[PDB]
Amino acid sequence: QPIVVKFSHVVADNTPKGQAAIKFKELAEKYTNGKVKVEVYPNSQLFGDAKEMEAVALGDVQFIAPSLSKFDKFTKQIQVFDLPFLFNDIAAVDRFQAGKQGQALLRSMESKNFLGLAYWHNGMKQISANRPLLKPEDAKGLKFRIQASDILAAQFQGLNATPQKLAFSEVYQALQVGTVDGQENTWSNIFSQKFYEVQKDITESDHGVIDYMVVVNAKWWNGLSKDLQDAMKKAMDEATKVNNDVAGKLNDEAKQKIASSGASKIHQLTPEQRKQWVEAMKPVWAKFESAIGKDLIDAAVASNDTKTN
Ligand SMILES: [Cl-]
Ligand SMILES: [Cl-]
């Protein structure tokens, strides 16, 4: 009777998270000599956004890797990752995650019996709708789908737009029948879930990030025999390295496919347009500073590094 272990997520197989979870499966089975069988369930086939945390708590799923925007019901510290324009680029996000404060966040939910094993990457968020979004004013009066995050809701409220919380699996349909006008996501997600086919203008804003925390039930994980836990720990580290190697290329490749399709128009901001977007979104920070903790915010800010000039 081999031990069945299930890994659930909401994205497609051909994605930074999807490819990493498949690597994890392959390696955990190898390193346990077949004693463990990993079943991977992509595209919300087993659980989606709304239920995966509960599934982990009850033992219906062993591994998940939610966006870092989806934890504000469990802690008020991880929501630091949602502050718009906090990180200039993916390199700053990774430096922050690797430092003391970023690594501390993996343990931020231990009192609720959740444990983060690793961070996985996706990429930078782009914004889209059915009209060009070149300046923040263009967003006024539009409905935007958002992940279930208080800071993302405030971010759109601040643009005098209307956020709407929806589960990832429901976004395409919402955009397709017009119950929402726009959204923010990474190129990888925008291509693989076909948002580009129902959004005619996408702006390369790079105004936030979608990255992930690999989460387990702490009690379950810590109760495993030393030999099984080491095997799976080895598999996880190696899957995390695949994720770090493929995330960038997969997003670049997605962007190109969207562009080549002709179905959407990709817009590039200029310095003055971008600077405007920054000003229009920064007040959100002051609203959440006390809840997050200024020091954590300052450490994130400091993770940015710009070459001279
Ligand atoms: Cl979902
Ligand atoms: Cl990590």
Side-chain angles (χ1 to χ4, degrees), residues 1-225 227-272 274-275 277-293 295-309:
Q1 292 82 356
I3 297 141
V4 175
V5 157
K6 311 186 182 178
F7 192 137
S8 181
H9 61 85
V10 299
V11 309
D13 283 344
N14 198 20
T15 65
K17 173 160 57 182
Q19 277 195 22
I22 287 161
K23 191 69 177 190
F24 175 70
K25 165 177 174 63
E26 166 183 338
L27 297 182
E29 289 168 6
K30 181 170 183 177
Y31 297 166
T32 66
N33 301 128
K35 293 179 163 100
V36 169
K37 180 76 162 157
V38 181
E39 289 155 11
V40 180
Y41 291 86
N43 287 314
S44 309
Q45 284 160 13
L46 191 71
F47 305 104
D49 284 340
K51 293 178 174 174
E52 50 183 0
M53 288 288 282
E54 285 166 321
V56 169
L58 268 53
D60 300 333
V61 76
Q62 284 56 57
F63 293 105
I64 56 179
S67 168
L68 300 163
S69 302
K70 294 167 181 181
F71 297 100
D72 77 11
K73 298 302 157 184
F74 301 92
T75 169
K76 299 303 192 190
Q77 290 183 89
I78 300 173
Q79 67 182 339
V80 68
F81 282 96
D82 288 348
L83 291 174
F85 290 108
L86 167 58
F87 304 107
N88 299 342
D89 57 30
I90 54 170
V93 183
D94 184 85
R95 268 196 292 283
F96 177 62
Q97 287 173 349
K100 178 69 183 75
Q101 294 301 323
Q103 289 286 293
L105 297 176
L106 296 175
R107 306 175 315 262
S108 68
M109 295 177 286
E110 256 170 21
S111 67
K112 289 176 169 62
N113 190 38
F114 296 98
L115 168 66
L117 286 186
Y119 287 102
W120 286 1
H121 299 309
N122 190 343
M124 308 296 299
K125 286 186 300 194
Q126 313 315 335
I127 183 162
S128 70
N130 296 308
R131 59 172 294 164
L133 305 163
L134 305 188
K135 67 176 178 303
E137 291 77 16
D138 300 339
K140 171 173 300 285
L142 300 182
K143 295 168 62 181
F144 284 98
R145 180 267 176 169
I146 59 156
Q147 291 167 84
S149 159
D150 290 331
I151 286 177
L152 302 177
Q155 142 186 321
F156 285 105
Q157 280 160 355
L159 299 170
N160 302 290
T162 301
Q164 183 128 292
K165 296 176 172 92
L166 285 187
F168 187 65
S169 60
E170 292 173 357
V171 184
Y172 173 85
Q173 182 97 308
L175 298 163
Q176 175 200 57
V177 308
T179 45
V180 300
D181 302 312
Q183 64 88 53
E184 38 172 30
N185 227 305
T186 68
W187 296 121
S188 177
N189 275 335
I190 283 173
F191 174 76
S192 63
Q193 301 300 334
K194 295 164 198 183
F195 303 163
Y196 73 103
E197 284 182 348
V198 287
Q199 293 279 262
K200 61 182 179 177
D201 296 274
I202 306 166
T203 294
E204 195 164 63
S205 47
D206 292 316
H207 64 272
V209 62
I210 289 174
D211 261 27
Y212 310 114
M213 191 180 289
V214 182
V215 169
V216 303
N217 181 310
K219 183 181 172 63
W220 175 74
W221 175 252
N222 287 326
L224 292 172
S225 59
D227 291 352
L228 292 160
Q229 186 199 74
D230 290 354
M232 294 206 273
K233 167 66 180 161
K234 195 171 171 222
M236 185 57 60
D237 288 346
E238 288 174 39
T240 297
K241 177 68 168 41
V242 173
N243 167 266
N244 297 8
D245 300 339
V246 306
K249 181 180 70 66
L250 289 182
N251 279 287
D252 293 335
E253 293 175 354
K255 186 188 181 201
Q256 190 60 58
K257 290 188 221 178
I258 296 161
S260 299
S261 75
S264 199
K265 276 72 186 171
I266 297 167
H267 307 281
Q268 291 175 339
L269 288 185
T270 189
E272 291 313 291
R274 190 189 182 268
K275 189 162 216 209
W277 282 93
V278 181
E279 311 203 33
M281 284 170 168
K282 185 74 151 61
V284 161
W285 299 32
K287 179 57 168 100
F288 287 87
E289 189 172 323
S290 295
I292 292 177
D295 291 324
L296 179 57
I297 295 171
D298 291 342
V301 163
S303 70
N304 288 283
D305 213 288
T306 60
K307 294 201 176 186
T308 301
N309 250 11

